[PDB]
Amino acid sequence: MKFQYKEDHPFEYRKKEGEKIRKKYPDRVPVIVEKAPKARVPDLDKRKYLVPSDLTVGQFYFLIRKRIHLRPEDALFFFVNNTIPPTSATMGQLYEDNHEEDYFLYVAYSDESVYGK
Template identity: 50%
Template sequence: MKPKPFKEEFTLEERAKESAAMIASYPDRIPVIVEKFSRSNLPELEKRNNCRYLVPCNMPVGQFILILRSRLHLSPGTALFVFVNNTLPQTVQLMGSVYESYKDEGDGFLYLCYSSEKTFG
Protein backbone atom coordinates (compact mmCIF):
# COMPACT_ATOMS: atom_id res chain seq x y z
CA MET A 1 0.00 0.00 0.00
CA LYS A 2 1.30 3.41 -0.99
CA PRO A 3 1.84 5.73 2.00
CA LYS A 4 -0.10 8.97 2.23
CA PRO A 5 1.90 12.14 1.63
CA PHE A 6 3.29 13.53 4.89
CA LYS A 7 1.16 16.68 4.61
CA GLU A 8 -1.99 14.55 4.34
CA GLU A 9 -1.05 12.20 7.16
CA PHE A 10 -0.43 14.93 9.76
CA THR A 11 -2.15 18.26 10.44
CA LEU A 12 -0.30 21.53 9.96
CA GLU A 13 -0.22 21.97 13.74
CA GLU A 14 1.31 18.50 14.27
CA ARG A 15 3.93 19.09 11.57
CA ALA A 16 4.85 22.57 12.86
CA LYS A 17 5.16 21.26 16.43
CA GLU A 18 7.40 18.38 15.29
CA SER A 19 9.74 20.54 13.19
CA ALA A 20 10.00 23.17 15.96
CA ALA A 21 10.93 20.44 18.48
CA MET A 22 13.54 19.02 16.08
CA ILE A 23 15.10 22.45 15.49
CA ALA A 24 15.08 23.24 19.23
CA SER A 25 16.83 19.94 20.06
CA TYR A 26 19.27 20.07 17.12
CA PRO A 27 19.87 23.72 16.12
CA ASP A 28 22.70 22.79 13.70
CA ARG A 29 20.42 20.48 11.70
CA ILE A 30 17.41 20.96 9.47
CA PRO A 31 14.19 18.90 9.39
CA VAL A 32 13.69 17.28 5.98
CA ILE A 33 10.83 15.17 4.62
CA VAL A 34 11.69 12.93 1.64
CA GLU A 35 8.94 11.39 -0.48
CA LYS A 36 8.86 9.47 -3.74
CA PHE A 37 7.53 11.26 -6.81
CA SER A 38 4.17 9.62 -7.53
CA ARG A 39 5.05 8.53 -11.09
CA SER A 40 8.53 7.28 -10.26
CA ASN A 41 9.39 3.60 -10.61
CA LEU A 42 11.87 3.77 -7.72
CA PRO A 43 11.06 1.95 -4.47
CA GLU A 44 9.47 3.63 -1.46
CA LEU A 45 11.63 4.23 1.59
CA GLU A 46 11.27 1.13 3.74
CA LYS A 47 9.46 2.54 6.77
CA ARG A 48 7.20 5.56 7.07
CA ASN A 49 9.53 7.15 9.63
CA ASN A 50 12.37 6.89 7.12
CA CYS A 51 10.94 9.89 5.28
CA ARG A 52 12.06 12.16 8.16
CA TYR A 53 15.66 13.27 8.32
CA LEU A 54 17.66 15.63 10.51
CA VAL A 55 20.35 16.83 8.14
CA PRO A 56 23.45 18.87 9.05
CA CYS A 57 23.20 22.38 7.61
CA ASN A 58 26.68 22.10 6.08
CA MET A 59 26.02 18.80 4.24
CA PRO A 60 26.13 19.14 0.43
CA VAL A 61 23.02 18.01 -1.46
CA GLY A 62 25.17 15.42 -3.27
CA GLN A 63 26.14 13.75 0.00
CA PHE A 64 22.48 13.60 1.06
CA ILE A 65 21.63 11.97 -2.29
CA LEU A 66 24.25 9.29 -1.55
CA ILE A 67 22.54 8.59 1.80
CA LEU A 68 19.18 8.26 0.03
CA ARG A 69 20.70 5.90 -2.56
CA SER A 70 21.90 3.60 0.22
CA ARG A 71 18.52 3.71 2.01
CA LEU A 72 16.74 2.85 -1.24
CA HIS A 73 19.23 0.04 -2.05
CA LEU A 74 19.68 1.29 -5.63
CA SER A 75 22.02 -0.43 -8.05
CA PRO A 76 24.97 1.67 -9.30
CA GLY A 77 23.38 2.20 -12.75
CA THR A 78 20.08 3.55 -11.39
CA ALA A 79 19.64 7.32 -11.62
CA LEU A 80 18.40 9.24 -8.59
CA PHE A 81 17.29 12.86 -8.77
CA VAL A 82 16.09 14.95 -5.85
CA PHE A 83 13.73 17.87 -6.36
CA VAL A 84 12.61 20.70 -4.12
CA ASN A 85 9.61 22.76 -5.31
CA ASN A 86 9.94 21.19 -8.79
CA THR A 87 13.57 22.32 -9.12
CA LEU A 88 16.76 20.30 -9.09
CA PRO A 89 19.18 21.73 -6.50
CA GLN A 90 22.88 21.71 -7.37
CA THR A 91 24.76 18.83 -5.75
CA VAL A 92 27.37 21.23 -4.32
CA GLN A 93 24.73 23.41 -2.68
CA LEU A 94 24.56 23.06 1.11
CA MET A 95 21.38 21.66 2.61
CA GLY A 96 21.13 24.68 4.93
CA SER A 97 21.04 26.98 1.90
CA VAL A 98 18.37 24.85 0.23
CA TYR A 99 16.38 24.90 3.48
CA GLU A 100 16.53 28.69 3.75
CA SER A 101 15.33 29.06 0.16
CA TYR A 102 12.65 26.37 0.07
CA LYS A 103 11.44 25.45 3.57
CA ASP A 104 7.69 25.26 4.06
CA GLU A 105 6.81 28.52 5.82
CA GLY A 106 3.77 26.89 7.42
CA ASP A 107 5.35 23.89 9.12
CA GLY A 108 9.14 24.48 8.97
CA PHE A 109 10.05 21.29 7.07
CA LEU A 110 12.03 21.10 3.83
CA TYR A 111 10.17 18.79 1.43
CA LEU A 112 12.24 16.81 -1.06
CA CYS A 113 10.92 14.51 -3.74
CA TYR A 114 12.96 11.81 -5.43
CA SER A 115 12.64 10.21 -8.85
CA SER A 116 14.66 8.35 -11.46
CA GLU A 117 13.73 10.91 -14.12
CA LYS A 118 15.26 14.35 -14.56
CA THR A 119 12.03 15.84 -15.87
CA PHE A 120 9.34 16.75 -13.38
CA GLY A 121 5.64 17.13 -14.07
Protein backbone atom coordinates in the same frame (compact mmCIF):
# COMPACT_ATOMS: atom_id res chain seq x y z
CA MET B 1 3.77 18.29 -5.57
CA LYS B 2 2.15 15.85 -3.13
CA PHE B 3 3.52 14.23 0.03
CA GLN B 4 2.07 11.48 2.21
CA TYR B 5 3.45 13.23 5.30
CA LYS B 6 0.96 16.05 4.70
CA GLU B 7 -1.88 13.57 4.16
CA ASP B 8 -1.10 11.99 7.54
CA HIS B 9 -0.53 15.19 9.55
CA PRO B 10 -2.25 18.59 9.26
CA PHE B 11 -0.20 21.77 9.14
CA GLU B 12 -0.65 22.65 12.82
CA TYR B 13 0.86 19.28 13.74
CA ARG B 14 3.75 19.57 11.28
CA LYS B 15 4.61 23.11 12.40
CA LYS B 16 4.88 22.19 16.09
CA GLU B 17 7.18 19.25 15.32
CA GLY B 18 9.36 21.19 12.88
CA GLU B 19 9.55 24.20 15.20
CA LYS B 20 10.66 22.13 18.20
CA ILE B 21 13.26 20.11 16.28
CA ARG B 22 14.81 23.29 14.83
CA LYS B 23 15.15 24.92 18.26
CA LYS B 24 16.65 21.72 19.68
CA TYR B 25 19.12 21.21 16.80
CA PRO B 26 19.93 24.63 15.30
CA ASP B 27 22.81 23.06 13.33
CA ARG B 28 20.54 20.41 11.73
CA VAL B 29 17.54 20.57 9.41
CA PRO B 30 14.42 18.35 9.30
CA VAL B 31 13.76 16.93 5.83
CA ILE B 32 10.78 14.99 4.47
CA VAL B 33 11.91 12.57 1.74
CA GLU B 34 9.31 10.72 -0.33
CA LYS B 35 9.13 9.10 -3.75
CA ALA B 36 7.61 10.95 -6.67
CA PRO B 37 4.25 9.43 -7.73
CA LYS B 38 5.17 8.12 -11.19
CA ALA B 39 8.74 7.30 -10.11
CA ARG B 40 9.99 3.77 -10.83
CA VAL B 41 12.30 3.70 -7.82
CA PRO B 42 12.15 1.53 -4.68
CA ASP B 43 10.47 3.02 -1.63
CA LEU B 44 12.07 4.22 1.60
CA ASP B 45 11.21 2.72 4.97
CA LYS B 46 11.52 6.16 6.61
CA ARG B 47 10.56 9.64 5.43
CA LYS B 48 11.55 11.99 8.29
CA TYR B 49 15.27 12.76 8.34
CA LEU B 50 17.44 14.93 10.60
CA VAL B 51 20.31 16.14 8.43
CA PRO B 52 23.44 18.09 9.44
CA SER B 53 23.22 21.58 7.97
CA ASP B 54 26.78 21.39 6.61
CA LEU B 55 26.10 18.21 4.63
CA THR B 56 26.08 19.01 0.93
CA VAL B 57 23.16 18.14 -1.34
CA GLY B 58 25.43 15.82 -3.32
CA GLN B 59 26.37 13.98 -0.14
CA PHE B 60 22.69 13.80 0.83
CA TYR B 61 22.03 12.36 -2.64
CA PHE B 62 24.53 9.54 -2.09
CA LEU B 63 23.26 8.72 1.41
CA ILE B 64 19.63 8.49 0.29
CA ARG B 65 20.61 6.46 -2.79
CA LYS B 66 22.33 3.91 -0.54
CA ARG B 67 19.25 3.66 1.69
CA ILE B 68 17.06 3.02 -1.37
CA HIS B 69 19.68 0.49 -2.56
CA LEU B 70 19.72 1.17 -6.30
CA ARG B 71 21.47 -0.79 -9.02
CA PRO B 72 24.48 1.08 -10.46
CA GLU B 73 22.63 1.70 -13.74
CA ASP B 74 19.60 3.21 -11.98
CA ALA B 75 19.12 6.96 -12.41
CA LEU B 76 18.05 9.13 -9.48
CA PHE B 77 17.11 12.81 -9.25
CA PHE B 78 16.00 15.03 -6.35
CA PHE B 79 13.35 17.75 -6.45
CA VAL B 80 12.71 20.68 -4.12
CA ASN B 81 9.82 22.94 -5.17
CA ASN B 82 9.77 21.25 -8.60
CA THR B 83 13.46 22.06 -9.14
CA ILE B 84 16.61 19.93 -8.96
CA PRO B 85 18.65 21.44 -6.09
CA PRO B 86 22.27 22.53 -6.54
CA THR B 87 24.89 19.90 -5.82
CA SER B 88 27.47 22.08 -4.04
CA ALA B 89 24.90 23.75 -1.77
CA THR B 90 24.69 22.65 1.85
CA MET B 91 21.48 21.21 3.26
CA GLY B 92 21.29 24.15 5.66
CA GLN B 93 21.61 26.52 2.71
CA LEU B 94 18.93 24.62 0.78
CA TYR B 95 16.72 24.58 3.89
CA GLU B 96 16.98 28.34 4.39
CA ASP B 97 15.90 28.99 0.79
CA ASN B 98 13.17 26.34 0.51
CA HIS B 99 11.72 25.37 3.91
CA GLU B 100 7.94 25.58 4.22
CA GLU B 101 6.06 27.35 7.01
CA ASP B 102 6.03 24.09 9.01
CA TYR B 103 9.85 24.38 9.30
CA PHE B 104 10.26 21.26 7.12
CA LEU B 105 12.25 20.86 3.92
CA TYR B 106 10.38 18.69 1.40
CA VAL B 107 12.42 16.61 -1.05
CA ALA B 108 11.07 14.18 -3.65
CA TYR B 109 13.08 11.67 -5.68
CA SER B 110 12.48 9.96 -9.01
CA ASP B 111 14.28 8.20 -11.84
CA GLU B 112 13.12 10.96 -14.22
CA SER B 113 14.67 14.42 -14.45
CA VAL B 114 11.20 16.02 -14.47
CA TYR B 115 9.24 15.84 -11.22
CA GLY B 116 5.94 14.41 -12.44
CA LYS B 117 7.37 12.43 -15.38
